Design a protein around this ligand. Structure first.
Ligand code: NA
Ligand code: NA
Ligand SMILES: [Zn+2]
Ligand SMILES: [Zn+2]
Ligand SMILES: [Zn+2]
Lengths: 290, 291
């Protein structure tokens, strides 16, 4: 059922594996994510950004997730506010039924990031909700201080990732020795943002359907595994899903100009998304952890 | 709020207007339909086919609608099983929370159609749910009178020359309006028009400008939809129009930005185009400003 984000991530912290945190914006993405979790016997972090919540309405975002939990009552599921920008945003998500909220004030200085994060934590913990924060590259000693002062449940340390399909213009590399240092001093679950890899087969599908991925590329599979070894426990994944989904939508549009049955577009798009999720669960080590 | 289908259609029947019955298969379709009803102050018939229910899961089909009703509690909404093919399917819909169910046995003989329809009615009415059936081969008005009286069905879909899909008329648009009037006077219940998509000219242009192909497509003219309401049609099944308007915008976004893979950029304009189709249809049929 729907559980506190910390319940899932504490396990992954103790046993040293990574749980994927998969964004959704509608029913098709959510269904494919849940089907993958059921087929790989993996716990699920379900994420909604503030833009996705505006698109769906927060009543629908939580409502659809609750329905899916009743459909697969054996899968541990956390519903996570992705990149909350204000206290009030995190507070609205708590009242709506989210079991995990992230407050992104990494763009602020240490002192204001910590003051706002601490405010979110108090409100959230009062309602039984776990909190993620961000910091950053990261400096391990202030991370130690940040975590102890804020009492946040998980932390996203900056180690060389960024959202989108365009992660590194040159060689891909992440500062894993910084990560191991953060992990030691904080001893809490850690979060990797911008962790989409753009698998080879997903890139092929998008470009085969006439898509333009520009010079985009993401974290190699090897560096996601090394991140988990370093102590990452929550791996944010979104771009990979969207590319795999829209590749199939473009394909159907191209191959049959007379097709306007929505299910003919989105049934193959769901399957491609679902396979990206299933492979990621195995890569990160959360398969068969229910 | 979610109400029995008859509560909406009996009002439409008494006052002589039509209520669009709009199919959905996912959240985007459902949201646009509800926004159209809110903006035109119109009651809503929300329909799901058996295929749509398989795609969504009946728990999600009903659950999404109940969330949307809480979001717009002032809008009368019926949740209708479209083209139920078996008693068991209609019974599952009743148990899940549907407020209206259609049993389509029109391909069976009259006697078998009546028997199955009557079985569905008894189960449905015991649960507080309204029932649609279908007759027609064009409908036989005298069969309809007997059918409605023996079955106690709440509304009837008489065949008068329409059909599902974008290719309804090879030749002249033709609907047997005389037959419709006879059925209405003999049955005196709300009547349903299936295959009622019109394929507006702007929707067709949109689909073709996006690179789509509609070879000789042809729907029910707006004037025929109005004539059919004047004749006693109170429920107007609409699906194809919604899908063409929706996918037209999906095709357009794909064509004009090959680097776009944010789903919202595809489906926000698609929702708006679908919503606009629904708003115009609500005004055409006369359910606008009836809340
Ligand atoms: Na997050
Ligand atoms: Na129907
Ligand atoms: Zn991020
Ligand atoms: Zn971030
Ligand atoms: Zn029909």
């Amino acid at each position: 059922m729907l559980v506190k984000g910390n319940e899932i991530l504490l396990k992954a912290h103790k046993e040293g594996y990574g749980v994927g945190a998969f964004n959704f914006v509608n029913f098709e993405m959510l269904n494919a994510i849940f089907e993958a979790g059921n087929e790989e016997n993996s716990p699920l972090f379900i994420q909604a950004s503030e833009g996705a919540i505006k698109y769906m309405g927060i009543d629908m975002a939580v409502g659809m997730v609750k329905i899916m939990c009743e459909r697969y009552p054996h899968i541990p599921v956390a519903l996570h506010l992705d990149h909350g920008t204000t206290f009030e945003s995190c507070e609205k998500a708590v009242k709506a039924g989210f079991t995990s909220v992230m407050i992104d004030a990494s763009h602020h200085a240490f002192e204001e990031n910590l003051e706002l994060t601490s405010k979110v934590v108090k409100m959230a913990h009062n309602a039984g909700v776990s909190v993620e924060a961000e910091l950053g590259l990261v400096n391990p000693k202030e991370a130690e201080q940040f975590v102890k002062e804020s009492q946040v449940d998980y932390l996203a340390p900056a180690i060389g990732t960024s959202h989108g399909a365009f992660k590194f213009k040159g060689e891909p590399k992440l500062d894993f020795e910084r990560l191991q240092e953060v992990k030691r001093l904080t001893n809490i679950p850690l979060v990797l943002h911008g962790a989409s890899a753009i698998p080879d087969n997903v890139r092929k599908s998008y470009l085969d359907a006439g898509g333009d991925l520009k010079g985009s590329k993401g974290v190699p599979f090897e560096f996601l595994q090394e991140s988990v070894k370093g102590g990452i426990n929550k791996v944010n994944t979104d771009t990979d899903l969207r590319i795999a989904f829209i590749a199939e939508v473009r394909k159907v549009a191209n191959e049959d100009k007379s097709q306007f049955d929505l299910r003919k577009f989105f049934s193959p798009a769901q399957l491609a998304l679902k396979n990206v999720v299933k492979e990621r669960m195995k890569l990160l080590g959360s398969a068969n952890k229910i």
